Amino acid sequence: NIEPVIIETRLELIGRYLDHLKKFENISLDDYLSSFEQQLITERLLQLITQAAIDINDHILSKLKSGKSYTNFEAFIELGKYQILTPELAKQIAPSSGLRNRLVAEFDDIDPNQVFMAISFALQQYPLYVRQINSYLITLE
């Protein structure tokens, strides 16, 4: 019931967002805090990356557990139970749901120091997410 072409479109977008986010991998904390423009770019990129993954996770779970509802945090954990993601990656990447909500929270007021840490987190974990979802699609034939 899963549509691979829909998931592949979102994985393709995650790769494009990560290529743009990689341009900020060597920026020091001081230069990052002094540039409001670079903060806005990385915040928007991190928001689009996490939302694309949430879109993929919901599409997979809607066909493996039809009618069942999952929070964005529990969706990552559920993929780890079924080995679609490794349990190690699922636990490490699950806090990206909290990063998503902080980036779209009505209260806003996000801490740029915490966003700085999320840049290094996303550049390390989300490439692994793309690999493991890609392997799941290949297994689905």
Binding site: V5, E8, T9, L11, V130, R131
Partner: protein, 141 residues
């Protein structure tokens, strides 16, 4: 409560005067077969003249649909069928349930125009899979 597709079709007759540039309204996503996913098709002439007196006329559709359907307009996602990818138009035509239609055969003319064959989707899948694999090779994961 949540309105059914039947009352959505009846309440959509009020859209001809509220949204005069609207030519077709299609419900897709989870609600058809959660958030409310609507696909709209504008009359290219009326929308251009409407934008002169409304700088953001496209972004007011969720608010208009919310007051008419009595649903939370903050959970409404709109897809412009006039300027969207060929992939999105395919799944809207395949799984969508039309709510408003002028003329009475607009949804049929839409399906015949945007529906993709299995071979065309396979070609799209091959291109995106190559793009994903290239990303994985560049990032060393």
């Amino acid at each position: 409560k949540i309105p059914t597709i039947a009352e959505l079709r009846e309440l959509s007759l009020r859209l001809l005067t509220k949204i005069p540039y609207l030519k077709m309204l299609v419900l897709f996503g989870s609600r058809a077969t959660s958030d409310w996913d609507f696909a709209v098709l504008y009359d290219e002439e009326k929308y251009n003249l409407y934008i002169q007196n409304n700088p953001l006329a496209a972004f007011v559709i969720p608010g208009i649909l919310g007051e008419i359907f009595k649903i939370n307009s903050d959970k409404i996602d709109i897809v412009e069928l006039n300027h969207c990818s060929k992939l999105i138009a395919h799944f809207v035509a395949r799984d969508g349930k039309v709510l408003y239609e002028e003329p009475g055969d607009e949804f049929d003319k839409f399906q015949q125009r945007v529906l993709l064959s299995n071979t065309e989707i396979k070609k799209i899948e091959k291109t995106k899979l190559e793009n994903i694999e290239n990303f994985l090779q560049r990032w060393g994961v």
